[PDB]
Design a protein around this nucleic acid. Structure first.
Length: 799
RNA sequence: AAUAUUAAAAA
């Protein structure tokens, strides 16, 4: 039961250059009628939704209970009809496989009430009415395609995008219905996800093992193959195709794996899989040296199995697979716009008989919305120049500029973990020469040559070397670590540097040492300066929100879930009034838990550090929360607002700073496109950085907005969505939109406006770093692993 | 790991 009401929208923004946009939201007209909600209970109880749908489809065809109605169904418990069914609780006995089915009336759901919420803004949006509409509009798609979350996919036709390792890309679309002012909106986007190829198990095995001289699998090969195929469904081909789920792969080859077979004589014998296939099916195995799949002592030789079609790949993709998939699926904004428009035409929503049954109509053109391009802030640099930077198309640079507070680097070391042959002494010297030149220009002078420069190999060499360095070189400020590509050395450098010894480290791939770029070296300096306590730039102070007239702390929070492994929570807090410098807190928690369990304590730590750093108690807390699943906003808000308040009260009983709580979401399918082709930016043709929308496609009365704060480089930009779930601070829409945009210009790792505010982005980096610190059991040990060293606690080690 | 953006997230 929600008790913290989200703020109503205080108004719409008026600041910024108007820009005409199109959104992939299509207006939906609904009849102002009652719809009838029935519960369906199917026994057996835990069949796949696709099986449940088959059952209800059978019943609807065979029991016209239903009359001439066309019910819609969610594949679970919920059926809806446009007029009442001629019943009171009805029990059915279906043979399609025998099912016991019961149906009973549950509710009347009002679309008149839904309409009233959308037009008047005087009542809550009735979620039960929205659900009925969502179910009706996706019913037919759910019968035709393969549903995956809120998307639909179908087998590749006319295209083929293998990812290697027995996986391929399927294209489809996302569909959702959302309330807006005046009308419901149908959100449609194209999508793509990885599925396992429908192919023989032997072929899947060869892809997974990178097999192009028949011999048994090595122990390594078998464990590898097992991890990939365990949990997948296979179908057999020797019986003319029964499906099974794979629970293991046998240690023994088919030639030697036995099971107990009872003979006619009553005696039970240990029969091998190969012998059994020969006698029972007259099947001589071609690969008896390969193991068997254990399914359901049921063992299947690999060669009688195929991977069942339509299985989405849930496991993480390799870097190559991920790169391949991004390539195959990237689309410019105008191309995506056309694909969506084309999809809508081919879909003919208005000709769907369920949509017709429920009197629904869908507009076939994208919704027009006038957005505004917010002004970008000016950044203030330091040095003798005291230069300013004026972002242009979301970007600026360091030319002629020096850091606001640049650190002088007097004592530094180099540790090269790439082989000396691939990174010679003269090459290291050219690298350091160029870096010192760039660092000087940036106002972060590296005074001399390194105190120490050594070659090493293997993760095991890191701690001995770093301990030596810490002990031998007083006042050591930095170790630059050269790495030979992707390596376990990185995780160990960060474990030892961040958690064990508390020493600043900056890693660099050998490829960027061998061939240097001024841009790459300049970017390295942005990180080094901040890691060593400096400030790269600040927002020009007089052009900020009035919240800066009193002490204010900005917090960013994120939660990361495992692909056993814990979930990781991270909260960062600003430590100055700029805001530029941040400190981080991080914890491990129960896997898949979405609420930040330890939020109160983490906030308390950050408030305490803010006081130490500034000598002020914050009178306002501005909290940007990333990682929140759609649908769970009320629950996360309830517990976390209380946890932030708890932190305050525990510091001092009457401490009640004004809290603004904002959810940041990039994982949605709202896309915005320039309506005037003339205003598109770059090759990708995206909306300009700063494009903001708070009308037409946003909530009918709550306080949410889209802001695409970044320049789109590739594909179609995702505009970040911001939901203001609490605001004690009385922000105007312009004020809070502008503040959010300015914070996207304070992110230290690049001279660009990034897609989410720096505090949220930092929390993401802190959580990701904890995953490296955890690279290697009991909960106590895991918690210790992510605790950074005392000398690291107060630093931006996550930059 | 210079960096942002970008797809997904019976036997």
């Amino acid at each position: 039961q929600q008790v913290f009401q989200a703020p109503r929208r205080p108004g719409i923004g008026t600041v910024g250059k108007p820009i005409k946009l199109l959104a992939n939201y299509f207006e939906v007209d609904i009849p102002k009628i009652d719809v009838y909600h029935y519960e369906v209970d199917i026994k057996p109880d835990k069949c796949p939704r696709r099986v449940n749908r088959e059952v209800v489809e059978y019943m609807v065809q065979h029991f016209k209970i239903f009359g001439d109605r066309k019910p819609v169904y969610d594949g679970k418990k919920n059926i809806y009809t446009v007029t009442a069914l001629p019943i009171g609780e009805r029990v059915d006995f279906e043979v399609t496989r025998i099912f016991k089915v019961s149906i009973k009336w549950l509710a009347i759901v009002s679309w008149r009430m839904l309409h009233e919420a959308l037009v008047s803004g005087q009542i809550p949006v009735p979620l039960e009415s929205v659900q009925a509409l969502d179910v009706a509009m996706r019913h037919l798609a759910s019968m035709r395609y393969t549903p995956v979350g809120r998307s639909f996919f179908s087998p590749p036709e006319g295209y083929y995008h293998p990812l290697g390792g027995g996986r391929e890309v399927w294209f489809g679309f996302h569909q959702s219905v959302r309330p807006a002012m005046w009308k419901m909106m149908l959100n449609i986007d194209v999508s793509a996800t990885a599925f396992y190829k429908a192919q023989p198990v032997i072929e899947f095995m060869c892809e997974v093992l990178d097999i192009r001289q028949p011999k048994p699998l090595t122990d390594s090969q078998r464990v590898r193959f097992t991890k990939e195929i365990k949990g997948l469904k296979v179908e057999v081909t020797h019986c003319g195709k029964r499906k099974y789920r794979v629970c293991n792969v046998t240690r023994r080859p088919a030639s030697h794996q036995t099971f107990p077979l009872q003979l006619e004589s009553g005696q039970t014998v240990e029969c091998t899989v190969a012998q059994y296939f020969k006698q029972k099916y007259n099947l001589q195995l071609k690969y008896p040296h390969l193991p068997c799949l254990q399914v359901g002592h049921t063992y299947l030789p690999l060669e009688v199995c195929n991977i069942v079609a339509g299985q989405r790949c849930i496991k993480k993709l390799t870097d190559n697979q991920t790169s391949t998939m991004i390539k195959a699926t990237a689309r410019s904004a105008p191309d995506r716009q056309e694909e969506i428009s084309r999809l809508m035409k081919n879909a003919s929503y208005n000709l769907d008989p369920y949509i017709q049954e429920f009197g629904i109509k869908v507009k076939d053109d994208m919704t027009e919305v006038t957005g505004r391009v917010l002004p970008a802030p000016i950044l203030q640099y330091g040095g003798r120049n005291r230069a300013i930077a004026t972002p242009n198309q979301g970007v600026w640079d360091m030319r002629g500029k020096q850091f606001y507070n640049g650190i002088e680097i007097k004592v530094w070391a180099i540790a090269c973990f790439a082989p000396q042959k691939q990174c010679r002494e003269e090459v290291l010297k050219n690298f350091t020469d160029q870096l010192r030149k760039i660092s000087k220009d940036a106002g972060m002078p590296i005074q001399g040559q390194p105190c120490f420069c050594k070659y090493a190999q293997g993760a095991d060499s890191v701690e001995p070397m770093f301990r030596h360095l810490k002990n031998t070189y007083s006042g050591l400020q930095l170790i630059i670590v050269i790495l030979p590509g992707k390596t376990p050395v990185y995780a160990e450098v960060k474990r030892v540097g961040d958690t064990l010894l508390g020493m600043a480290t900056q890693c660099v791939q050998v490829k960027n040492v061998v061939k240097t770029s001024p841009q790459t070296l300049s970017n390295l300096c942005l990180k080094i300066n901040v890691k060593l306590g400096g400030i790269n730039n600040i927002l020009v102070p007089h052009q900020r929100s009035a919240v800066f007239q009193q002490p204010v702390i900005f917090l960013g929070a994120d939660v990361t879930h495992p692909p056993k492994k814990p979930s990781i929570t991270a909260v960062v807090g600003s430590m100055d009034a700029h805001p530029s410098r941040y400190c981080a807190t991080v914890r491990v928690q129960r896997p898949r838990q979405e609420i930040i369990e330890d939020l109160s304590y983490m906030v308390r730590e950050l408030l305490i550090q803010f006081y130490k750093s500034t000598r002020f108690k914050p009178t306002r807390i501005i909290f940007y929360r990333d990682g929140v699943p759609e649908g769970q906003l009320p629950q996360i808000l309830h517990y976390e607002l209380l946890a932030i308040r708890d932190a305050c009260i525990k510091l001092e009983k009457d401490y009640q700073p004004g809290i603004t709580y904002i959810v940041v979401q990039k994982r949605h399918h709202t896309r915005l496109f320039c309506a005037d082709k003339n205003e598109r930016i770059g090759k990708s043709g995206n909306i300009p950085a700063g494009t903001t929308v708070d009308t037409n496609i946003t909530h009918p009365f709550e306080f949410d907005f889209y802001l695409c704060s970044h320049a789109g480089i590739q594909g179609t930009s995702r505009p970040s969505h911001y939901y203001v779930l609490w605001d004690d601070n009385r922000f105007t829409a312009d004020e809070l939109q502008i503040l959010t945009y300015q914070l996207c210009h304070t992110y230290v790792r690049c001279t660009r406006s990034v897609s989410i505010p720096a505090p949220a982005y930092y929390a993401r980096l802190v959580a990701f770093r904890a995953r490296y610190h955890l690279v290697d059991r009991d909960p106590q040990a895991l918690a210790k692993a992510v605790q950074v060293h005392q000398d690291t606690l107060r630093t931006m080690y996550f930059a």
